[PDB]
């Protein structure tokens, strides 16, 4: 399917406003499980539930364990670019 590059802006006192599930230990990609209303992902648009996050800010998430992805994602700030594909 199409790999979309999706932009999101957030202040440091904000979360991304997504939940993720999956990861290498589960044999599945890092998947968006929920988009929280009113938060940056929702307000900025372009992300959807069921999207696999292939990368964030150029950092490949394709073979990451759940906790690694949590770390990487949680450390991104300001203008953030996701590369996602709906599965």
């Amino acid at each position: 399917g199409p790999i979309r590059k999706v932009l999101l802006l957030k202040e440091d006192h904000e979360g991304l406003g997504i939940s993720i599930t999956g990861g290498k230990e589960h044999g599945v990609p890092i998947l968006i499980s929920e988009i929280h209303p009113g938060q940056p992902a929702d307000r900025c648009g372009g992300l959807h539930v069921g999207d696999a996050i292939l990368a964030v800010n150029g950092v490949n998430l394709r073979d990451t364990k759940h906790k690694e992805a949590v770390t990487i994602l949680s450390q991104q700030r300001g203008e953030i670019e996701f590369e996602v594909v709906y599965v």
Binding site: G15, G17, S19, I20, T21, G22, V28, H66, V70
Partner: peptide, 6 residues
Amino acid sequence: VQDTRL
């Protein structure tokens, strides 16, 4: 899996 809010 786990489910983590970010």
